Amino acid sequence: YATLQNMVVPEIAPGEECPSDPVTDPAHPLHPANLVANTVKRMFHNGRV
Amino acid sequence: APQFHRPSTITADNVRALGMRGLVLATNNAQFIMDNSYPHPHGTQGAVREFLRGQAAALTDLGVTHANNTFAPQPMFAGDAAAEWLRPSFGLKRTYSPFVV
Amino acid sequence: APQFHRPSTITADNVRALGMRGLVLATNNAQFIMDNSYPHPHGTQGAVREFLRGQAAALTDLGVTHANNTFAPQPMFAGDAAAEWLRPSFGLKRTYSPFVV
């Protein structure tokens, strides 16, 4: 449980759509700007889902 | 200032004073005929250790020019975290593209 | 401000007042040396009990900042409706996209 409530959630821009691609859009939480060590959305990217 | 066509000019400071891009050109534009009048005093294979230490340090130069382009090196494996008595340590499988817009 | 290298420092209010994003880097910048001069009064197993109650209370604070992003949560299952003698209690298969433009 200590690494399920442990993630990087960027705030959405006012008037922008939802981020769908982790590769291009930096507001996506699985983007390589957000893939920190010891976290689970990077573990969403280590094990790619 | 190193000169490649002689054995006893290359030192550690002579390799790292030129970067990665310039070392592509000057080694592809050097002299064919090797001089042998005064060789390297630690032998002609001793300078082989002397040059190539400056190459893996030359991408630490390119790591700095792309420190505004790549990411900080996260620990690739577990066991590396300040707190291990309440939280575990992951390690990032660095399949991602080090790429900052 | 809690110190993660001391078990007798972390309370529920120290974790909740710190943000969820600020809780990430504060746990990664702690000390590798674990101090045993002042343990937690409920034991070392009790310090694990105190720390994680502040994280789940911070998920409720995260739902407040994202209340303009999702909607009001509908009742999921049977048996819960105001007027049950003329219409039943509905429940959503929550597979939609909770998103406010």
Automatic annotation (TrEMBL), chains B, C:
Q: Which top-level group of life is the source organism from?
A: Viruses
Q: Where in the cell is it found?
A: Virion; Host nucleus
InterPro entries, per database record = Herpes_UL35
Has the keyword Ubl conjugation been applied to this entry?
Answer: no
Please provide an example of a Pfam family that matches this protein in its UniProt record. Answer: Herpes_UL35
A cellular component term from Gene Ontology for this protein is: host cell nucleus
Name the predominant localization: virion
Kindly state a single biological-process term from the GO annotations of this entry.
viral process
Keywords assigned by UniProt, alphabetized: Capsid protein, Host nucleus, Virion
What does this chain do?
A: Participates in the assembly of the infectious particles by decorating the outer surface of the capsid shell and thus forming a layer between the capsid and the tegument. Complexes composed of the major capsid protein and small capsomere-interacting protein/SCP assemble together in the host cytoplasm and are translocated to the nucleus, where they accumulate and participate in capsid assembly.
Family assignment? Belongs to the herpesviridae small capsomere-interacting protein family.
What is the protein name given in its UniProt record? Answer: Small capsomere-interacting protein
